[PDB]
Amino acid sequence: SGFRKMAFPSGKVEGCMVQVTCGTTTLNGLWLDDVVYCPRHVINYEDLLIRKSNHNFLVQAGNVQLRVIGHSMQNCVLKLKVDTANPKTPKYKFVRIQPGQTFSVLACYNGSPSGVYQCAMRPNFTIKGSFLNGSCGSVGFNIDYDCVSFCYMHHMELPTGVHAGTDLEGNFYGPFVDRQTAQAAGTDTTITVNVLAWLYAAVINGDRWFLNRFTTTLNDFNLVAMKYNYEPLTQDHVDILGPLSAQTGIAVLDMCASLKELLQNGMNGRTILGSALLEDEFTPFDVVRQCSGVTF
Amino acid sequence: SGFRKMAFPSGKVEGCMVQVTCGTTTLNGLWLDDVVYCPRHVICTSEDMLNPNYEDLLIRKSNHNFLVQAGNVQLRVIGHSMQNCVLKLKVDTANPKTPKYKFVRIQPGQTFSVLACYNGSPSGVYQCAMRPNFTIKGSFLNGSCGSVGFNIDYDCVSFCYMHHMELPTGVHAGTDLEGNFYGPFVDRQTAQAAGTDTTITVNVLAWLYAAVINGDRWFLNRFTTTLNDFNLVAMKYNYEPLTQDHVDILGPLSAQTGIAVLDMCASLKELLQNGMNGRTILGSALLEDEFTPFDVVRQCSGVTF
Ligand SMILES: O=C(CN1Cc2ccc(Cl)cc2[C@H](C(=O)Nc2cncc3ccccc23)C1)NC1CC1
Ligand SMILES: [Cl-]
């Protein structure tokens, strides 16, 4: 029993965190094999980079100084070729995630991991994270068996306190650029498929007060959801919720009729899984993994 | 900016997780140096759980009855002893990944990270607090027994909890690493229930100071309160009594924001009376109590917004 926001074990990622210093700027880097990946703002980026030599970049892995032997740029990410391969390099892939997908964040300062937390890529491409100055280069990841899938690298904080960053190939999530300008996060929406998954997790944990005898159509549900700034629910979302629907005996459009009633009437002093708000940072797969016991 | 429930990086603890099998039971163990620590109920059948005599069950076992697995490698048990509700298995190999560590017993209200495991394999990490009723609201399934709670302040791992059982309400009970249970619980399948839980007042206050640090003051008022009057109101909402120690502990956060502890206590009184009226505090519609004054100072900036 119990339902917590759970992050993946961070150990395989801790063994890759390094400190990168270029002049007066100090941020975090990801050391995989003989390459260190970090935000390019550590340094017209081609004009700034052409003026630098390998020794201008100071890379620290624990107490050991790594020697930079080459450097190149890929989108908004700087790739520093080092003389030593990381002996703690795990099996890994670079993956780009979609909004609504969740991931673990290992928050670092001066190449030292300080905390781990779980979060989701919002529909507006921002992440509601917890980062202070020096956190740049902290990474987001998922684990599938023994393989680490790197999906995010922190670049900046927006004026509303939310965060923006890139995939590990330097491509930003959202319409953001890596520089000081007037940029704001778009209006956010609720990840509907995630709220439904969390309602199924509540039923699995013995919370059924919100269930009713009604069912609805996908069209009618989307007309109501659009009015409460909820993401449209697609047929793919309904298919993805199939296993949870079969496990609890509550059809997806049966659970949508419960969500519609919670949206129009509220919770009325009651909570779901200890929460007074409808939770959207647990995907269908997270619910199945936390209520099954998948290990790494 | 931002305020998340943050767990400590789990790597130092992952390198200590092993699988312990005794007969038909399989649970998790903590391998530190040449000793593997695990719940003593690993020597029990489901039948034994009603009235188990652990001394009688243990005297009938030999070293080769305990199977310990560290990854793909089988560890050989060379000794065994019981310390309260934990079984200590002496192994022939010291753990090369043993970090710097201490065994610490925590008090209710204290927080810690939990590395949830099954078959000696870590599957997830989360942050939680020791409730005033000595239970933990965790997320554990069958096979999680032996999963551990810890803090990693500086480079040292402080082990404070080992999971032993789930109570009928879905909450969890366990011991410190010396086998002493937190709360009036026994590793016996007995009619035992968690006492009425209360809100950790000093933690809610700390979290209200964290909201003021991150720029939110809508909940503040012009009133103050005596400590006694605050506790008379707090007891009516099932909040833990706030002691003079709690007020002293909140000293640095009070000095950083310019809001006296008893003035923040007055805001808490008013929040309990009125609710949030459609507003949230740090993205929450409920008053949060699983962040200590020490966690707030650790996570939040030193400069107030
Ligand atoms: O199904 C049982 C059998 N349990 C009896 C029992 C009695 C005393 C002691 Cl110390 C341990 C135990 C085990 C125990 O409580 N294990 C577990 C731990 N953590 C989370 C769980 C989640 C689901 C199932 C078992 C869990 C086995 N009871 C549980 C109340 C559902
Ligand atoms: Cl303590």
Side-chain angles (χ1 to χ4, degrees):
Chain A
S1 299
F3 207 67
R4 287 268 173 192
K5 195 146 285 173
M6 211 161 297
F8 279 108
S10 59
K12 285 163 164 56
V13 178
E14 292 168 51
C16 308
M17 302 307 310
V18 300
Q19 182 196 52
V20 184
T21 304
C22 194
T24 196
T25 309
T26 298
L27 44 67
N28 312 280
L30 188 66
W31 181 29
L32 295 169
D33 301 310
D34 62 344
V35 177
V36 170
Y37 301 82
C38 75
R40 76 179 173 172
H41 70 79
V42 74
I43 72 190
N44 194 313
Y45 289 99
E46 181 215 354
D47 186 53
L48 298 166
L49 198 58
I50 61 98
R51 306 173 190 197
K52 304 235 165 191
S53 60
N54 297 323
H55 271 196
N56 289 142
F57 302 97
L58 309 174
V59 176
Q60 247 195 255
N63 260 52
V64 189
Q65 198 77 24
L66 299 184
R67 178 180 148 94
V68 174
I69 61 171
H71 62 271
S72 76
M73 186 168 286
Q74 180 177 12
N75 303 304
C76 304
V77 155
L78 180 56
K79 296 194 275 194
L80 299 173
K81 198 66 155 174
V82 290
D83 64 359
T84 310
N86 190 4
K88 297 175 169 202
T89 306
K91 262 207 66 178
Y92 79 92
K93 304 163 178 169
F94 283 169
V95 309
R96 184 169 177 95
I97 62 164
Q98 299 299 312
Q101 287 182 310
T102 60
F103 57 102
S104 299
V105 174
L106 183 65
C108 310
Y109 300 98
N110 301 294
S112 178
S114 74
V116 63
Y117 61 86
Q118 186 75 0
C119 71
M121 174 60 61
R122 301 306 308 171
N124 69 0
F125 295 100
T126 69
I127 79 167
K128 293 179 176 175
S130 177
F131 294 122
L132 295 180
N133 186 53
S135 58
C136 307
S138 294
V139 296
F141 64 96
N142 288 279
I143 306 183
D144 48 295
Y145 301 129
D146 61 331
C147 177
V148 178
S149 296
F150 292 108
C151 63
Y152 178 88
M153 170 164 278
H154 186 53
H155 278 63
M156 69 197 197
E157 183 173 288
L158 297 172
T160 51
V162 299
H163 305 109
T166 69
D167 58 23
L168 267 294
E169 304 194 295
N171 300 292
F172 257 97
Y173 287 99
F176 307 111
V177 294
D178 62 332
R179 50 182 238 254
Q180 182 58 54
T181 190
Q183 44 189 344
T187 302
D188 206 18
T189 49
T190 297
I191 308 157
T192 317
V193 64
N194 284 11
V195 174
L196 289 170
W198 172 83
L199 285 176
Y200 276 116
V203 175
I204 286 161
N205 265 248
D207 247 1
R208 312 176 67 96
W209 65 260
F210 49 69
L211 301 180
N212 64 18
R213 64 154 63 244
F214 308 103
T215 192
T216 195
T217 65
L218 189 58
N219 255 34
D220 282 352
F221 174 76
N222 286 332
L223 285 170
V224 174
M226 193 180 303
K227 155 188 160 164
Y228 294 96
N229 289 318
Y230 264 61
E231 269 299 288
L233 190 77
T234 71
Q235 186 46 69
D236 189 28
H237 292 152
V238 175
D239 293 348
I240 286 162
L241 288 163
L244 289 172
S245 173
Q247 185 191 327
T248 65
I250 302 155
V252 181
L253 301 163
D254 177 7
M255 192 62 95
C256 284
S258 288
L259 181 58
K260 182 220 295 173
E261 304 310 318
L262 299 172
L263 287 175
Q264 303 160 338
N265 309 332
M267 301 220 201
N268 298 13
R270 286 171 298 196
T271 61
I272 297 170
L273 294 172
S275 184
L277 288 179
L278 297 174
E279 174 75 55
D280 71 353
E281 301 211 349
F282 293 104
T283 72
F285 304 102
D286 294 340
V287 171
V288 169
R289 200 162 305 117
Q290 187 165 167
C291 313
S292 84
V294 176
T295 64
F296 313 92
Chain B
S1 187
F3 207 69
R4 284 269 185 204
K5 194 146 287 172
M6 212 163 297
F8 279 105
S10 61
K12 286 163 164 44
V13 179
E14 293 168 51
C16 307
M17 300 308 310
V18 300
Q19 181 195 52
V20 184
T21 304
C22 194
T24 195
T25 310
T26 296
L27 44 67
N28 313 280
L30 187 66
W31 182 28
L32 294 169
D33 300 310
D34 62 343
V35 177
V36 170
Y37 301 81
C38 75
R40 75 180 173 171
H41 70 79
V42 74
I43 72 189
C44 296
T45 74
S46 291
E47 180 182 28
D48 286 310
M49 293 310 304
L50 289 177
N51 289 299
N53 192 312
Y54 292 99
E55 291 98 0
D56 188 55
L57 298 165
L58 191 55
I59 197 65
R60 306 174 190 268
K61 305 236 164 190
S62 60
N63 297 324
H64 65 272
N65 289 142
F66 301 98
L67 309 173
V68 176
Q69 246 196 256
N72 261 51
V73 190
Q74 198 77 24
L75 299 185
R76 179 171 88 89
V77 174
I78 61 171
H80 63 271
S81 75
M82 185 166 59
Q83 179 178 12
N84 303 306
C85 304
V86 298
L87 179 56
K88 293 195 275 194
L89 299 174
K90 198 66 154 174
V91 290
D92 214 24
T93 310
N95 190 4
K97 297 179 180 165
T98 306
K100 261 201 64 193
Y101 73 95
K102 314 179 242 182
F103 285 172
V104 178
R105 184 172 176 92
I106 61 165
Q107 299 299 312
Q110 185 62 272
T111 62
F112 57 102
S113 306
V114 174
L115 182 65
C117 309
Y118 302 98
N119 300 290
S121 269
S123 73
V125 63
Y126 61 86
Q127 186 75 358
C128 73
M130 174 60 59
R131 300 306 307 172
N133 70 358
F134 296 99
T135 70
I136 79 166
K137 292 181 177 173
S139 174
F140 290 123
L141 297 179
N142 186 54
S144 61
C145 295
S147 294
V148 295
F150 64 95
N151 287 283
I152 315 176
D153 307 289
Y154 322 111
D155 213 55
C156 189
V157 182
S158 53
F159 292 107
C160 60
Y161 177 89
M162 170 164 280
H163 186 45
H164 274 66
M165 65 186 200
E166 181 173 289
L167 297 173
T169 51
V171 298
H172 307 96
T175 70
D176 57 23
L177 268 293
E178 305 195 297
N180 295 113
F181 258 96
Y182 286 100
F185 308 111
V186 292
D187 49 1
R188 210 186 134 198
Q189 179 101 248
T190 213
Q192 46 186 342
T196 58
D197 206 20
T198 53
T199 298
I200 307 157
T201 317
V202 65
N203 283 11
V204 174
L205 289 172
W207 173 84
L208 285 176
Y209 275 116
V212 175
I213 285 161
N214 286 252
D216 213 358
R217 307 179 44 107
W218 67 259
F219 48 79
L220 300 181
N221 66 16
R222 52 176 238 280
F223 306 101
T224 191
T225 185
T226 72
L227 183 59
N228 202 42
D229 279 357
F230 171 77
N231 289 329
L232 285 171
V233 177
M235 266 80 134
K236 294 164 198 191
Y237 295 95
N238 289 319
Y239 264 60
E240 268 301 286
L242 190 78
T243 70
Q244 185 50 241
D245 276 22
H246 292 151
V247 175
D248 294 348
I249 287 161
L250 288 163
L253 288 173
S254 164
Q256 186 191 325
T257 64
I259 302 155
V261 180
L262 295 177
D263 287 351
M264 193 62 93
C265 282
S267 313
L268 181 50
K269 273 167 73 181
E270 180 173 295
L271 277 176
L272 296 173
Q273 170 187 261
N274 301 339
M276 299 200 187
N277 194 18
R279 286 170 298 197
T280 61
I281 298 169
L282 294 173
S284 183
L286 287 186
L287 297 175
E288 291 244 48
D289 71 353
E290 301 210 348
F291 293 105
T292 72
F294 192 99
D295 294 343
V296 170
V297 168
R298 204 177 182 277
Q299 186 173 165
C300 298
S301 182
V303 187
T304 305
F305 180 42

